Amino acid sequence: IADEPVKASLLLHVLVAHKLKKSLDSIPMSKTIKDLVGGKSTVQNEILGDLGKEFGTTPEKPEETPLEELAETFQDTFSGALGKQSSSLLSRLISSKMPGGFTITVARKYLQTRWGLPSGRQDGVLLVALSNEPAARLGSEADAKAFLDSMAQKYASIVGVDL
Amino acid sequence: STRPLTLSHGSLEHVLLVPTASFFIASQLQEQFNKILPEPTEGFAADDEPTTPAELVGKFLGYVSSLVEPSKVGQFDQVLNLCLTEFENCYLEGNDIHALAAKLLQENDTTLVKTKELIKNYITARIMAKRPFDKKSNSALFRAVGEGNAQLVAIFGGQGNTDDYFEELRDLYQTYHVLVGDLIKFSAETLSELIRTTLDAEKVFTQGLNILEWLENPSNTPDKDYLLSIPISCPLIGVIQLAHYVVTAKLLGFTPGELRSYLKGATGHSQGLVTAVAIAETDSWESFFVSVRKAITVLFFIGVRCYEAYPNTSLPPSILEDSLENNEGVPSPMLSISNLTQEQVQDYVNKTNSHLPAGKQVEISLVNGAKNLVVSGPPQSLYGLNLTLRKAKAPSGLDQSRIPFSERKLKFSNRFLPVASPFHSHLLVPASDLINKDLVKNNVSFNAKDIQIPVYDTFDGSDLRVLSGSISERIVDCIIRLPVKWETTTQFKATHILDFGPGGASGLGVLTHRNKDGTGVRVIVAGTLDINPDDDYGFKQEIFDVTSNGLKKNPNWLEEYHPKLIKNKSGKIFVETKFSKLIGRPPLLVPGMTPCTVSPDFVAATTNAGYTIELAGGGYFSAAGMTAAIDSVVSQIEKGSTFGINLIYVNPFMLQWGIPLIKELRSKGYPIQFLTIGAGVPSLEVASEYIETLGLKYLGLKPGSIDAISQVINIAKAHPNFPIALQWTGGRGGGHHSFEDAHTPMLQMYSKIRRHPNIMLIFGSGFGSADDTYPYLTGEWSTKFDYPPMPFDGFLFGSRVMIAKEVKTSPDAKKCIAACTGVPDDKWEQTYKKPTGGIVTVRSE
Amino acid sequence: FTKVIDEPIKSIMDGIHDGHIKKLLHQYYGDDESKIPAVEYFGGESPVEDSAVFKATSSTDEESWFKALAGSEINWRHASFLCSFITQDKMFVSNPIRKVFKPSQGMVVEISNGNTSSKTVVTLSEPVQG
Numbered sequence A: 001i002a003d004e005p006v007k008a009s010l011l012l013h014v015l016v017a018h019k020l021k022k023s024l025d026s027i028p029m030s031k032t033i034k035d036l037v038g039g040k041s042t043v044q045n046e047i048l049g050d051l052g053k054e055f056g057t058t059p060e061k062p063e064e065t066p067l068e069e070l071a072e073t074f075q076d077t078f079s080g081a082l083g084k085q086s087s088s089l090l091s092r093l094i095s096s097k098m099p100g101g102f103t104i105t106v107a108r109k110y111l112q113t114r115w116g117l118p119s120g121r122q123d124g125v126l127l128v129a130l131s132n133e134p135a136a137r138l139g140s141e142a143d144a145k146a147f148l149d150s151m152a153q154k155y156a157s158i159v160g161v162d163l
Numbered sequence B: 001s002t003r004p005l006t007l008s009h010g011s012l013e014h015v016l017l018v019p020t021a022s023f024f025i026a027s028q029l030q031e032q033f034n035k036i037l038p039e040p041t042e043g044f045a046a047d048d049e050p051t052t053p054a055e056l057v058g059k060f061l062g063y064v065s066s067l068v069e070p071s072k073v074g075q076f077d078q079v080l081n082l083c084l085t086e087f088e089n090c091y092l093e094g095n096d097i098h099a100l101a102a103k104l105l106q107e108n109d110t111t112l113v114k115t116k117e118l119i120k121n122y123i124t125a126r127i128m129a130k131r132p133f134d135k136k137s138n139s140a141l142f143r144a145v146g147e148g149n150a151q152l153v154a155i156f157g158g159q160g161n162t163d164d165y166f167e168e169l170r171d172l173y174q175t176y177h178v179l180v181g182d183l184i185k186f187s188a189e190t191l192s193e194l195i196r197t198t199l200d201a202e203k204v205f206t207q208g209l210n211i212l213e214w215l216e217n218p219s220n221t222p223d224k225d226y227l228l229s230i231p232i233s234c235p236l237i238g239v240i241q242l243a244h245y246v247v248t249a250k251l252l253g254f255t256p257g258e259l260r261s262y263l264k265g266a267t268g269h270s271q272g273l274v275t276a277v278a279i280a281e282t283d284s285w286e287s288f289f290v291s292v293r294k295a296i297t298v299l300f301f302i303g304v305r306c307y308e309a310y311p312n313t314s315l316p317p318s319i320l321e322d323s324l325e326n327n328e329g330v331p332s333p334m335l336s337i338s339n340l341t342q343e344q345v346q347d348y349v350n351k352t353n354s355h356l357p358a359g360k361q362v363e364i365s366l367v368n369g370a371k372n373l374v375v376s377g378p379p380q381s382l383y384g385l386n387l388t389l390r391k392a393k394a395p396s397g398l399d400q401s402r403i404p405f406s407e408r409k410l411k412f413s414n415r416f417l418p419v420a421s422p423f424h425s426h427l428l429v430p431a432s433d434l435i436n437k438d439l440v441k442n443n444v445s446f447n448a449k450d451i452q453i454p455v456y457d458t459f460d461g462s463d464l465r466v467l468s469g470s471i472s473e474r475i476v477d478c479i480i481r482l483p484v485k486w487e488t489t490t491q492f493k494a495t496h497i498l499d500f501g502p503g504g505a506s507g508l509g510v511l512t513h514r515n516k517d518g519t520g521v522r523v524i525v526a527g528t529l530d531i532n533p534d535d536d537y538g539f540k541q542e543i544f545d546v547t548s549n550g551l552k553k554n555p556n557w558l559e560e561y562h563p564k565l566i567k568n569k570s571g572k573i574f575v576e577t578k579f580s581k582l583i584g585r586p587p588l589l590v591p592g593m594t595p596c597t598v599s600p601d602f603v604a605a606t607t608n609a610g611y612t613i614e615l616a617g618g619g620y621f622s623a624a625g626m627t628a629a630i631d632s633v634v635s636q637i638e639k640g641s642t643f644g645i646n647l648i649y650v651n652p653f654m655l656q657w658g659i660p661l662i663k664e665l666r667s668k669g670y671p672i673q674f675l676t677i678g679a680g681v682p683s684l685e686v687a688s689e690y691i692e693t694l695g696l697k698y699l700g701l702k703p704g705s706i707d708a709i710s711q712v713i714n715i716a717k718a719h720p721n722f723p724i725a726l727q728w729t730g731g732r733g734g735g736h737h738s739f740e741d742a743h744t745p746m747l748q749m750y751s752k753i754r755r756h757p758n759i760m761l762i763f764g765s766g767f768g769s770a771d772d773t774y775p776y777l778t779g780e781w782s783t784k785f786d787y788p789p790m791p792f793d794g795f796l797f798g799s800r801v802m803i804a805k806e807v808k809t810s811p812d813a814k815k816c817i818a819a820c821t822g823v824p825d826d827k828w829e830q831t832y833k834k835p836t837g838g839i840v841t842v843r844s845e
Numbered sequence C: 001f002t003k004v005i006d007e008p009i010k011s012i013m014d015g016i017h018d019g020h021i022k023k024l025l026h027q028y029y030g031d032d033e034s035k036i037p038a039v040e041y042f043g044g045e046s047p048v049e050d051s052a053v054f055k056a057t058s059s060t061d062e063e064s065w066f067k068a069l070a071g072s073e074i075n076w077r078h079a080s081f082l083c084s085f086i087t088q089d090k091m092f093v094s095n096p097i098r099k100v101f102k103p104s105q106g107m108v109v110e111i112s113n114g115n116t117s118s119k120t121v122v123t124l125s126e127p128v129q130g
Ligand SMILES: Cc1cc2nc3c(=O)[nH]c(=O)nc-3n(C[C@H](O)[C@H](O)[C@H](O)COP(=O)(O)O)c2cc1C
Pocket: B591, B592, B593, B594, B595, B596, B616, B618, B646, B677, B678, B679, B702, B729, B732, B733, B734, B735, B736, B764, B765, B766, B767, B796, B797, B798, B799, B800
């Protein structure tokens, strides 16, 4: 499969979904941050902090504009990078859900071997695996394989690439 | 004689030099700790797993303290004392634990809960080692206050800051158990006694108020909807504020009275005013609990009687689904409304109050700012007002950048607050008499002589010590009935504000910061460890830090950017500004103008007068044509004079010969001092090329919108040493012009621009003298709009210089220019329709 | 404000500049020119001891180095070390004094009479043949 850099659109979708504790389906893309949160402002400041750490600069009043406009504004200065904290979010995902012997290097080289997805797709499949957090000890290595197999299928169905 | 003792967690390690006389006992814990310690992993990103050597020594301190008994002298006291002392010496460089915690967050890959664990361990260790905080700290802030270089004011927030306040109390019981455990246990026992004394109290507490059971075991905690109900939330928000006060008093070693004395004044927002008076009573650690009792007793009787005056009722599902579908919150008795003036909101409430009967009428309850209001009333009546508002607002994803400012549809927000009772409204009035009858039964008075510091009234902003009658009757009256004029009540002069209230960064402090930006007031959020990336307001670490970072002044724009006079050896007086200091000429520039400044004879004549002027790239079509113009400017200016170039960004044909020609000419050392890119702002990578490769002194950028101003900020942040000239004009300019007001975008962006000291902020459009410009030099221009003064670094004069002797404009065109009467700023937008003051707007190619 | 035709560009700009000076003088210096702080030359200030001896190392900060050599008083040596550009006729080339005193292991800069501008003498010394 051809190496493609991670899209800014699916990154914003994953960060906002993963922070609000919902599925990636339940967050529509044509939606504002004030729309999704509502009256609650505690999570507003840490969401705006998660946009300001991931890309660096943000447009003015980013909470009152759809995530479509944020995706097209951020993609212009965004090139394949995983930011800073989203590498600590997948580090927390595999040290708490993935079992022993499931280091990123082992899951990365395996889904490069079997599936054939390069580093630009590996990022995308790890972000899809984070968005629908299993919230369960995946002790069985093989059940955790079926997990990343179902998350490589979800990434393939979203982006629109045959496998 | 000391033996090394290594304790480790994978890669990260620490070696204690423990005396051999206590090595056998200290070696014991090293394996038990390493048994308790989980399996070392990559990155240490798992929970309950130390990330840095500091956290590890922390986890050890925590584990050792868990075995030490305070009452009985144990064998482990000796091993605790030297591992604590080692941690202090090797990490706390004379500083506080909160400064360490804050350092481990922004450098290391440590998450918030790990630092919260570290703090708890260190503090528990310190109290278990029988080493209470009795030595007064050397915190930079309280040193400064002693000297008289900083005045503190303690503000206490109230309701509506968070739907999840109770977890803020849980964090205090977890992290600072030892400091506030006794306070919390006292308040819980006080509240339980007040339930058994008041006749119908038990009716209101359906799931009880056993707050010790809810803190020890999270699962037995009731749902957020119960916790939000005022009879719980009112006293408990009181406790959280007092717990944050106590933690601050204890970790600085002060008594409450000493800490209260160090404050110039103290006020609070809504029920926060009860806690602000409660501390102004206090003195010694032994006489604290009598002030606390009064405070908790007031908030309990407000909570109970204000619930029995207006209990929340089930809301029709039709209103709920309409609200959620149309992207509002769950309706509540208090509606927040941003970005509308109070007169505007008062119109929209008069519309709604005209139809409704007396006992269903909304009213403005809080003025939290110029344009930040909270309406209180029945949740339906506010959903009524919310429909009226939705009808009269623009869609949030609308592009009005192409519509003249004056005709734009005003865009605002309106959300329901996470509160459960309409505070500061006619609906709670029946409770007033009942509350006061109950405070006199429980012998809960505040007396004016006992209040050591001034306590500012939320209505009129006056001190409560000068009040005639009962102060408690005025506190009740200011919470349940009278509105809160927050900008009136925070008129006090202070360099620092301590926000103890709940909500942390979503609390009263950050709102007060917004309201005071550029007046040289630093808000410190006293109840939250965190890191502000902007660093515009402080966090809990600032209070306890002993280095300079503790005492951080927020800029006062009037003083920071004061225009000054300065003379050179010769005698020539200059106006000194950020801009004139750089270029060593008056802060007045004639901008690039096609065709006024395409002439080399005018660019020479304005350079020779000693003023900066851009040669206009708009009037040249090749490098040879511009090279020949420039050569004519250099042949006409004096030795060591300079000038600039204006290249149009929307003309990519001009840029592809323009930029290489500048690069070439600067390599030959032609006196091109700067480049202005007009008609659009470059991208970061193109700007980064222009800044690095052209060998320029500065770069002019003429943003049109707020989006463009953000792109200038971003360019300046990526090259923090290179000077950027942000030449701001409104739509009232000559030539190609935007739709934008000259004032409104600067009012919004001034603060952000000023965060970047390499931006020289130049003002243009509508200037022709020293009288119209002066209010922008001195910054008084922004006082008309109720903002603090916003001084500018320089001015540009396009239209004004078009009838000068040296301009190539034809004599009949000069007479035609001079015959235009013009118009003032408020009329200019008429140019879109008809000839306004001799001038009209037309579309280009 | 565009009323008076064929006013010389000096007369317009000076009028605005002087207008500001006259208004600031009255408001902030009590209409007294003698309260205006003087310098030698006004310009080239980015918006961001008599007898001394400096010793350049490998790790010496270029900007700190030049600031130290320059001194605090605005005078000829302040320009010499902090001007980024000097003039050859009408051209603007890189300040050769900053290139020459660019800090490197071995270099020793002895300043004598660094209080009086008239008499100041910045001496650079290097290992020459050991
Ligand atoms: C005749 C004329 C020509 C102009 N030509 C240009 C130009 O080529 N590029 C540019 O960025 N701005 C141009 N401007 C805008 C000026 O740079 C400046 O923003 C404007 O003149 C300020 O408004 P004011 O004219 O009311 O003083 C022009 C303005 C005028 C009046």
